[PDB]
């Protein structure tokens, strides 16, 4: 169930410095597999996961075409946007776009997203009924009109349900050893006295995949949402993640603090305290 | 493969 292919697009002006610039990255779930960067010597689509390096040239040539196209349409949209908002040519602005497709346990398209931001704010976004849009402001509302006329939600829906999903699967079969494995965390709890009066412990999840996890310091077996601290899941740098969670407490109150960690490759949501 | 985007 619930696999997905997502692309992430970023393009920006650089008045005073140089030509707009366009960058794209594709993931399958939480594994990035492809990249493209406008500023390259001769921009080309390059791999990022081992398992895609297996496609023949037609794949590279084709996506390199689509990105060279996607390069120019953004140079262009950058410019159109300076028109819809009365913006000067001398300030740099940015476009960001995510689109992707989720597939069922069976593999049909479960959900599909396409989402535009200008300058950090939402711009235009396609709705769950892959036909309509939510337009952030008046500018996006021109776009919305422009796109209803070109029936450009239907073009979108044709891709999602066809080219993406077809490829979503074509990959998953090539990199199944990578992409259909769930790596459960290697978890450890650590001992840190900030004083005799008060001492903190730390729930450690290391080298896990995918990036989804829950580290909950259960006091007496309860969440303690307001007194605990946690860092956002971070990347290891191989294709794996790590998160930690800590809490400050009076000493000798150790064992009643159990750490609940749930993760996709975990049969039992593991509860753990730890001492020497 | 990747989508090609509309203008505007």
């Amino acid at each position, epitope marked *: 169930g619930s696999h997905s292919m997502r692309y992430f697009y970023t393009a920006m002006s650089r008045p005073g410095r140089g030509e707009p610039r366009f960058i794209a990255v594709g993931y399958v779930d939480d594994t990035q597999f492809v990249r493209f960067d406008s500023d390259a010597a001769s921009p080309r689509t390059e791999p990022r996961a081992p398992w895609i390096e297996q496609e023949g040239p037609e794949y590279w040539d084709r996506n390199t075409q689509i990105f060279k196209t996607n390069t120019q349409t953004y140079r262009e949209n950058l410019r159109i946007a300076l028109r819809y908002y009365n913006q000067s040519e001398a300030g740099s602005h940015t476009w960001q776009t995510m689109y992707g497709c989720d597939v069922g346990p069976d593999g049909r398209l479960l959900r599909g997203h396409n989402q535009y931001a200008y300058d950090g704010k939402d711009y235009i976004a396609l709705n769950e009924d892959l036909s309509s849009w939510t337009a952030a402001d008046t500018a996006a509302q021109i776009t919305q009109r422009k796109w209803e006329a070109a029936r450009e939600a239907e073009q979108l829906r044709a891709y999602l349900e066809g*080219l993406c999903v077809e490829w979503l699967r074509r990959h998953l079969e090539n990199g199944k050893e990578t992409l259909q494995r769930a790596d459960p965390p290697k978890t450890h709890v650590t001992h840190h006295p900030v004083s005799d009066h008060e001492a903190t412990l730390r729930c450690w999840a290391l080298g896990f995949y995918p990036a989804e996890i829950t580290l909950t310091w259960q006091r007496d077996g309860e969440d303690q949402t307001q007194d605990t601290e946690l860092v956002e899941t971070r990347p290891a740098g191989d294709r794996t993640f790590q998160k930690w969670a800590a809490v400050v407490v009076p000493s000798g109150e150790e064992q009643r603090y159990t750490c609940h960690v749930q993760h996709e490759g975990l049969p039992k949501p593991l509860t753990l305290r730890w001492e020497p | 493969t990747a989508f090609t985007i509309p203008s505007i």
Partner: T-cell receptor
Amino acid sequence: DPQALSIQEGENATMNCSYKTSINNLQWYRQNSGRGLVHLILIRSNEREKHSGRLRVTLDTSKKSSSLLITASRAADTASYFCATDDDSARQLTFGSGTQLTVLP
Amino acid sequence: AGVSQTPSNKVTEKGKYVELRCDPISGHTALYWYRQSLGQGPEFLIYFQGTGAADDSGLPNDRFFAVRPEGSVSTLKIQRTERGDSAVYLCASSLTGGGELFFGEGSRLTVLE
């Protein structure tokens, strides 16, 4: 380069083409006549079937072939008829050979 | 009334320089060029998105080059003209990219020995 069709006026013309390319986002039907220009109707890779006016378009994405059918064909309808596919949703239309239609009285 | 291409006819010999114009629909961002010859499909040439090429894989060779400075009007430049190049060159306009193509009437260009 699917032969010319001559048919009698009022009776139904049916033209076929086939695209080879990976997916298409959509497929188009184009009317090209005398020296002039080229011209239109559109079906998506996710709908089997679409009607406008006297036209009915059909898409089979397993045989990567389509069928345009003109209903009650008239003199005006005499033109060559061309397929276009949008090749990887990547917006360049690819046109096929298509078909010399001649509706005679 | 639509995408005016110009000059509807050009007739020259080997080795000369030809300049095909086309003025597309206002507010259309994509501008395609195609070419076609007696009883064949139009073939792809180049495809502008605003002020520049986003795809030029149709171009058969370095003698072919198109332009569209101000983003509206395009121009097709051919050089060392040859018999081979003889065809109708089609100019189209899309609103956003792909979907419905609005062609101009064309320019019939014959290149003789």
